[PDB]
Short mmCIF file of N, CA and C in Angstrom, two decimals:
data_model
loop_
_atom_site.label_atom_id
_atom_site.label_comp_id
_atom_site.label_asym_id
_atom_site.label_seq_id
_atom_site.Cartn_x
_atom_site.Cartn_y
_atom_site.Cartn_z
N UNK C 1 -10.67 -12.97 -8.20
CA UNK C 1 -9.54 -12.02 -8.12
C UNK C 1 -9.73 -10.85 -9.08
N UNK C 2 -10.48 -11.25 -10.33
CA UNK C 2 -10.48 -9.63 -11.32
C UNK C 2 -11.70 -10.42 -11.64
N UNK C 3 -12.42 -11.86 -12.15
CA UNK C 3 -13.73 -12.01 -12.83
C UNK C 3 -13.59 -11.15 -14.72
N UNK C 4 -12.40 -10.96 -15.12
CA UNK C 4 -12.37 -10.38 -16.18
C UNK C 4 -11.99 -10.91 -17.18
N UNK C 5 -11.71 -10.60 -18.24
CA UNK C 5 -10.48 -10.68 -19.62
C UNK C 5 -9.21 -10.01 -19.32
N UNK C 6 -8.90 -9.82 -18.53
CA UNK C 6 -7.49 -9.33 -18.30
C UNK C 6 -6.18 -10.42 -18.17
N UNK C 7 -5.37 -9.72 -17.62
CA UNK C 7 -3.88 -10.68 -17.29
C UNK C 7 -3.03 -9.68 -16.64
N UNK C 8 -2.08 -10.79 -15.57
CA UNK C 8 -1.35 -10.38 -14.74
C UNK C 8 -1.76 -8.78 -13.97
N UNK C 9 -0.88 -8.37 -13.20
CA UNK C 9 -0.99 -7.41 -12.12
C UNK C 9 -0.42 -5.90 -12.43
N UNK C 10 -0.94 -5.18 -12.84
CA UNK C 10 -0.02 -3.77 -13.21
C UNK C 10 -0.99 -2.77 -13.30
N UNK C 11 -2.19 -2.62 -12.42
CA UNK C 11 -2.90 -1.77 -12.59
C UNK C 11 -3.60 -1.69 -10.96
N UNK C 12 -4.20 -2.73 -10.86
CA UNK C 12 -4.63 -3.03 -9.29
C UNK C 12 -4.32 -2.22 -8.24
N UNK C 13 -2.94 -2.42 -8.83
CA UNK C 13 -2.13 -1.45 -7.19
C UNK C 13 -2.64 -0.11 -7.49
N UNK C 14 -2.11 0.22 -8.01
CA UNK C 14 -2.46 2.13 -8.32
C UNK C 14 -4.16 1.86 -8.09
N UNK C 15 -4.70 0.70 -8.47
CA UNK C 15 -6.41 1.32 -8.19
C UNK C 15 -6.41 0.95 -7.05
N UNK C 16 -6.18 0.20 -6.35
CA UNK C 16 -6.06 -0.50 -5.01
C UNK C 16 -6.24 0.49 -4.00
N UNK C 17 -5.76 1.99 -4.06
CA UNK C 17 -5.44 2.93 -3.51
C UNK C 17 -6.80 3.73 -3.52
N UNK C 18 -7.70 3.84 -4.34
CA UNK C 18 -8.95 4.14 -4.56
C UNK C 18 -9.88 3.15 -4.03
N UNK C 19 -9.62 2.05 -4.33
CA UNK C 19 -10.79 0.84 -4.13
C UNK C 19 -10.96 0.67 -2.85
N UNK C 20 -9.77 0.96 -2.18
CA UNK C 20 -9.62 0.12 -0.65
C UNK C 20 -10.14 1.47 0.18
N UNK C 21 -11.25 1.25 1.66
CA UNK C 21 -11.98 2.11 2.21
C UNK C 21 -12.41 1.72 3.72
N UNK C 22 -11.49 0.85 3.99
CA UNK C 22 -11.65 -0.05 5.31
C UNK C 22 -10.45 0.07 5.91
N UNK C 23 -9.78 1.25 6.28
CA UNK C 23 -8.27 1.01 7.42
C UNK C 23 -8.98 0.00 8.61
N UNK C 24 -7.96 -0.84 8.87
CA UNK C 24 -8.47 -1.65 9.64
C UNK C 24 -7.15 -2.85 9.78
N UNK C 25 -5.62 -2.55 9.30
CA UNK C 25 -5.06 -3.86 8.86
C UNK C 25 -3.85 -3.00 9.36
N UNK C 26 -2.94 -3.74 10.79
CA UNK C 26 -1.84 -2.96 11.53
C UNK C 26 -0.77 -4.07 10.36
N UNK C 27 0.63 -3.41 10.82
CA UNK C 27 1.68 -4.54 10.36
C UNK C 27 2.93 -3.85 10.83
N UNK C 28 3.53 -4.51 10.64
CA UNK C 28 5.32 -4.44 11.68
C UNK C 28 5.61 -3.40 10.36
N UNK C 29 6.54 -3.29 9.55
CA UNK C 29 7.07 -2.56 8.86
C UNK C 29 6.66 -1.19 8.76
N UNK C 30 4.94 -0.70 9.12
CA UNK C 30 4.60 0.32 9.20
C UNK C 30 5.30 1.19 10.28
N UNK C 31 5.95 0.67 11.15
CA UNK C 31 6.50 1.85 12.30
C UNK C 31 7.84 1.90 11.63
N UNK C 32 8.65 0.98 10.53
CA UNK C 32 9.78 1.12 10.24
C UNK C 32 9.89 2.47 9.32
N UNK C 33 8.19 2.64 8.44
CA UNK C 33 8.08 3.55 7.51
C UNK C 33 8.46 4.75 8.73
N UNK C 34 8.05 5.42 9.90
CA UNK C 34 7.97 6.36 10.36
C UNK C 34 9.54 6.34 10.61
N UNK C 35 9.82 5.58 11.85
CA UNK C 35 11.44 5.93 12.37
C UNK C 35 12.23 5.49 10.88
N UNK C 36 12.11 4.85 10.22
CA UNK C 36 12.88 5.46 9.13
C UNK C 36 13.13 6.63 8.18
N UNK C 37 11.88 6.42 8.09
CA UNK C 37 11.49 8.04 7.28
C UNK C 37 12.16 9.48 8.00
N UNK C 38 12.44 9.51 9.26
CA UNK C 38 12.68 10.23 10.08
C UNK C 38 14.07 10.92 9.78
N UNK C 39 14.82 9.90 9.27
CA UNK C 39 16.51 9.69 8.87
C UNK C 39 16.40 10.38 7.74
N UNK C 40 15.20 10.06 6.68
CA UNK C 40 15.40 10.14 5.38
C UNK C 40 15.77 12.14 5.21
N UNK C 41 15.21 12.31 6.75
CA UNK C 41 15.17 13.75 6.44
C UNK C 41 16.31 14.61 6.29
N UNK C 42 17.26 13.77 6.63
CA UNK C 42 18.64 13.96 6.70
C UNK C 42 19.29 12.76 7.02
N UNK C 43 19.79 11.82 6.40
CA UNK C 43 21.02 10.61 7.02
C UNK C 43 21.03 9.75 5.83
#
């Protein structure tokens, strides 16, 4: 999972965003981001 001297989770994510280079992974909530987001523009 890290192979390090570290502890717990508070950095990963923010690198996660760099590290990761394979779109390839669908999921339900992603269409909620759009038609929701849609509202956000006003509602």
């Amino acid at each position: 999972s890290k192979l390090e001297g570290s502890e717990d989770s508070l950095y990963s994510d923010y690198v996660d965003v760099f590290y990761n280079t394979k779109p390839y992974k669908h999921r339900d909530d992603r269409l909620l981001q759009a038609l929701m987001d849609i509202l956000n523009e006003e509602n």
